[PDB]
Amino acid sequence: PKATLKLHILIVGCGMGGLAAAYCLGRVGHKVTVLEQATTIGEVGAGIQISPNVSRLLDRWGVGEAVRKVAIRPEGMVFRRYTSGEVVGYARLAERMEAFGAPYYHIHRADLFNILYSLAAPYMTLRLGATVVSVDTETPSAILATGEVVHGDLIIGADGVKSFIQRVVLGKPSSAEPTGDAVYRAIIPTALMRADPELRPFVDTPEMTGWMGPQRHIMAYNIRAEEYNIVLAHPDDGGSADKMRSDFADFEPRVQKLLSFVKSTLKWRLMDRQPLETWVHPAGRVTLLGDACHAMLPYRAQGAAMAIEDAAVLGVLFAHISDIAQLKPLLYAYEELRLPRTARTQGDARSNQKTFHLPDGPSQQARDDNMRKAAQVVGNSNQWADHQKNQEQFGYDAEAAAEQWWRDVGESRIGSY
Amino acid sequence: KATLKLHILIVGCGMGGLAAAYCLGRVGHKVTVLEQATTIGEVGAGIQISPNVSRLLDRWGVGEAVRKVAIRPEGMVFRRYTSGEVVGYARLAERMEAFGAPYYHIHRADLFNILYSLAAPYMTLRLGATVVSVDTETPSAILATGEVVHGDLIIGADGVKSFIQRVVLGKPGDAVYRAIIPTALMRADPELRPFVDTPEMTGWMGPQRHIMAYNIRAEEYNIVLAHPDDGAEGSADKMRSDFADFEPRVQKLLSFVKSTLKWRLMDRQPLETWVHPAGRVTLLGDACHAMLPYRAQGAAMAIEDAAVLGVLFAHISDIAQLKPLLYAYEELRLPRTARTQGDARSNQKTFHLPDGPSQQARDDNMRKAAQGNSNQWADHQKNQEQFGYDAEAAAEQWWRDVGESRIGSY
Ligand SMILES: Cc1cc2nc3c(=O)[nH]c(=O)nc-3n(C[C@H](O)[C@H](O)[C@H](O)COP(=O)(O)OP(=O)(O)OC[C@H]3O[C@@H](n4cnc5c(N)ncnc54)[C@H](O)[C@@H]3O)c2cc1C
Ligand SMILES: Cc1cc2nc3c(=O)[nH]c(=O)nc-3n(C[C@H](O)[C@H](O)[C@H](O)COP(=O)(O)OP(=O)(O)OC[C@H]3O[C@@H](n4cnc5c(N)ncnc54)[C@H](O)[C@@H]3O)c2cc1C
Ligand SMILES: [Cl-]
Ligand SMILES: [Cl-]
Structure with a gap:
């Protein structure tokens, strides 16, 4: 599975999207340069959830063992009432x-990043301290803040929620915007939890625990043997650990204990964007991936999944390029394959903002009832207990989708050019 | 309360008998229970009590007592025999x-005692009273001593080897080991402690055999091992030998068993009828729908049987209505119990598959919680049908829709 025509591909951004794209495109014969503005690389000190649609790909790419060594395999997802901790929902x-x-x-974001880096490294010329400030959309070329021109055949903006390349693609200022929600992000020692009989079960029976309250919710889960991840969503108004404790003072007693163990916290503002009208610059030499085109509320735990899926689809499509005339149609095939799924996913995250943050009242009572009975789509419910939603989200195979597309459509539409 | 107060003879003081005595007594009927044993009580074993049952116990005012002694499991977990690999979950x-x-x-004895507390004020219990013959016309139950006991109606709650069933009908391969082990021994082993600390119903499935196990009290873990009966206190040695191929955690659990009850399981096709044609004798519980215990609903069905009897017989005002009421009881109960017996049969097959395509397909169905060859308790429809059922509501619905006008015409 190699491309007849080898491109020089410029990837802006060395987050997880960038890494996965560098691996997926490099392994099919393309030359890859990654331009990263920061002078270091790595992920922040926090947990991430990786669903089957992602871990299918990690397994396929030969890093399943590394994932398995560091990561925790939760048994269930448990939703609870803020004041008491009463379980109102379970999804196996x-x-x-x-x-x-x-x-x-x-899994810890750093462990996941390091695993992706191990795949990408031989495939990418990484340039750190390289801030893209302009683009020649025709050639194309990425222009650094120093004025250095970096020539290639294609530019992928994997440059996150403050993407410059999104601005290039749409030909104007354009941004993800604040949502009115922020999170505190914290890791605590499992050792402190194991020492308390009420908190030990949260370590010894790994689950994704969600406490839902008025305008706020907490998600918590083990991410390494020594570390338990906690994320607290709350109204953004603009003693960091102290303000967090204060903001969640009405949550149940076990929550108060967990928060008493937090020494410090990342404060993080949550951005969201309406789906873009296009991911492709009209001249057909620049496109987007990850948070640069589908930044979403994190309440569906699929943002990195979507970035990595985006990369996997690019890899499959671009194994088939044999002529430069096919480049622009392939970018539109990528967009066609990815825009609807990512937009739906952004949608489900927005639905969960509402569901998770209901005030006490009729809606909250109905939500809790739906969650107890695991209501099926055949202030709403537990998406992860819905078989159809699970099939659609987690049963998806990014590589298979793109191959199916090539066979059914791409071959006859692009394949002759 | 009933306009016409009957004298009702109940043969058997197991759980069916007790529930019938309570349900019939509280609506005005006089109740005599004839039990052949000179004591009452239950065997040392666990039982699972589903919402269809506990809804009724709650309604009858014993919910707090039940809650105090019961364990509330989190889930039901099905595992492969060789490895213990989880292949299914039902929340x-x-x-x-x-x-x-x-x-x-819950422990069978705790449940029995709670039922006894409900029935006791309503019944005259006669122990050492073995019914050996029946006058189906009068009717009367005649004891082994020759004493004749008169009443208006006889209910056979006299178990899997019911004599009254033989009266009513007018004509003449699996076993389990049952054990309890101390939770202390499990708590002491880091591999076994989770089974105590996270209460589940665990089922290990293998060729021709399966094990079910669950906590029933603070100190006690219930274990039941189904296996081919080649045809009673059993040998714990033979049990261990029969399950020597099951996963190492199971070997540990069985190494803790000091003794075992050996218990033969009988499965019966549904009866053609539960009413003697003269309309003075009927059946309840294992006396009419003894099933393989693989669906954990035998006592549920007996208690439901009783609850429907109570509702129907609150309405009797004339002796002419008695026979039609027994047929209404049968009509309300026979199809559900037969379906239930059927689900237990289907589980025999599912649980006992040899390794092969079927077993692989079962495991796949169980992982994904297919909505047979699967985990009935993970199926929403089956759950609604079995556990969403309210015996008293069903019978009142029936009264409103049909019974008032149909039994009104006697
Ligand atoms: C609280 C929270 C919880 C989450 N939980 C989950 C979860 O459980 N599961 C899940 O799948 N997803 C989760 N996500 C989403 C996930 O974190 C992101 O979608 C993903 O990390 C985005 O990766 P990316 O590579 O597109 O972007 P980024 O990680 O933003 O990387 C972009 C990179 O581009 C560089 N860059 C920017 N501009 C320039 C430029 N002009 N020139 C050069 N380089 C530049 C940046 O410096 C950065 O290194 C969560 C997100 C949040 C906030
Ligand atoms: C291994 C196993 C596990 C089970 N697990 C479950 C479970 O999880 N959930 C569930 O709901 N059910 C379960 N059951 C089923 C349940 O135990 C029975 O369905 C129920 O106990 C039957 O009650 P009964 O009162 O109809 O009959 P029995 O309990 O058999 O009582 C009949 C009584 O009548 C007496 N008697 C008999 N003949 C006469 C006579 N001629 N005169 C006077 N008295 C007489 C007997 O001595 C006895 O006392 C299980 C059964 C088994 C074997
Ligand atoms: Cl997300
Ligand atoms: Cl049973």
Whole structure:
């Protein structure tokens, strides 16, 4: 599976999107340069959830063992009432998720980044301290803040929620905007939890726990043997750990204990964007991936999934390029394959903002009832207990989708050019 | 309360008998229970009590007592025999409380005592009273001593080897080991402690055999091992030998068993009728729908049987209505119990598959919680049908729709 025509591909951004794109495109014969503005690389000190649609790909790419060594395999997702901790919903993870062909893991962002870096490294010329400030959309070329011109055949903006390349693609200022929500992000020692009989079960029976309250919710889960991840969503108004404790003072007693263990916290503002009208610059030499085109509320835990899926689709499509005339149509095929899914996913995250943050009242009572009975789509419910939603999200195979597309459509539409 | 107060003879003081005595007594009928044993009580074993049952116990005012002694399991977990690999999960806990009452694990004796407390003020219990013959016309039950006991109606709650069933009908390969082990021994082993600390119904499935196990009290873990009966206190040695191929955690659990009850399981096709044609004798519980215990609903069906009898017989005002009421009882109960017996049969097959295509397909169905060859308790429809059922509501619905005008015409 190699491309007849080898491109020089410029990837702006060395987050997880960038890494995965460098691996996926490099391994099919393309030359890859990654231009990163920061003078270091790595992920922040926090947990991430990786669903089967992602871990299917990690397994396929030969890093399943590394994932398995560091990551935690939760048994279930448990939703609880803020004041008491009363369980109002369960969605089975574990073998219920493995039925889609790979596990549902909880992992430290740094461990995941390091694993992706191990795949990308031989495929990418990484340039750090390289801030793209302009683009020649015709050639194309990426122009650094120093004035250095970097020539290639194609530019991928994997440059995140403050993407410059999004601005290039749309030909004007354009941004993800604040949502009115922020999170505190914290890791605490599992050792402190194991020492308390009420908190030990949260370590010894790994689950994704969600406490839902008026305008606020907490998600918490083990991410390494020594570390438990906590994320607290709350109204953004503009003693960091102190203000967090204060903001969640009405949550149940076990929550108060967990928060008493937090020494410090990242404050993080949550951005969101309406879906873009296009991911392709009209001249057909620049496109986007990851948060640069589908930044979403994190309440569906699929943003990195979508970035990595985006990369996997690019890899499959661009293994088939044999002529420069096919480049622009391939970018539109990428957009066609990815825009609807990512937009739906952004949508489900927005639905969960509402569901998770309901004030006490009729809606909240109905939500809790739906969650107890695991209501099926055949202030709403537990998406992860819905078999159809699970099939659509977690049963998806990015590589298979793009190959199916090539066979059915791409071959006859692009394949002769 | 009933306009016409009957004298009702109940043969058997197992759980069916007790529930019938309570349900019939409280609506005005006089009740005599004839039990052949000179004591009453239950065997040393666990039972699972589903929402269809615990809804009724709650309604009858013993919910707090039940809650005090019961364990509330989180889930039901099915595992492969060789490895212990989890191949299926069905959520219990709040998933089951969505049907209006909890799914409990409880010691048979604790449940029996609670039923006894309900029935006791309503019944005259006669122990050492073995019914050996019946006058189906009068009717009367005649004891082994020759004493004749008169009443208006006889209910056979006299178990799997019911004599009254033989009266009513007018004509003449699996076993389990049952054990309890101390939770202390499990708590002491880091591999086994989770089974105590996270209460589940665990089922290990293998060729021709399966094990079910669950906590029933603070100190006690219930274990039941189904296996081919080649045809009673059993040998714990033979049990261990029969399950020597099961996963190492199971070997540990069985190494803790000091003794075992050996118990033969009988499965019966549904009866053609539960009413003697003269309309003075009927059946309840294992006396009419003894099933393989693989669906954990035998006592549920007996208690439901009783609850429907109570509702129907609150309405009797004339002796002419008695026979039609027994047929109404049968009409309301026979199809559900037969379906239930059927689900237990289907589980025999599912649980006992040899390794092969079927077993692989079963495991796939169980992982994904297919909505047979799967985990019935993870199926929403089957759950609604079995556990969402309210015996008293069904019978009142029936009264409103049909019974008032149909039994009104006697
Ligand atoms: C609280 C929270 C929880 C989340 N939980 C989950 C979850 O459980 N599961 C999940 O799948 N996703 C999750 N996500 C989403 C996930 O974090 C992101 O979608 C993903 O990390 C985005 O990766 P990316 O590579 O597109 O962007 P980024 O990680 O933003 O990387 C972009 C990179 O581009 C560089 N760059 C920017 N501009 C320039 C420029 N002009 N020149 C050069 N380089 C530039 C940046 O410096 C950065 O290194 C979560 C997000 C949040 C905030
Ligand atoms: C291994 C196993 C596990 C089970 N697990 C479950 C479970 O999880 N959930 C569930 O709901 N059910 C379960 N069951 C089923 C349940 O135990 C039975 O369905 C129920 O106990 C039957 O009650 P009964 O009162 O109809 O009959 P029995 O309990 O058999 O009582 C009949 C009584 O009548 C007496 N008697 C008999 N003949 C006469 C006579 N001629 N005169 C007077 N008295 C007489 C007997 O001595 C006895 O006392 C299980 C059964 C088994 C074997
Ligand atoms: Cl996300
Ligand atoms: Cl049973």
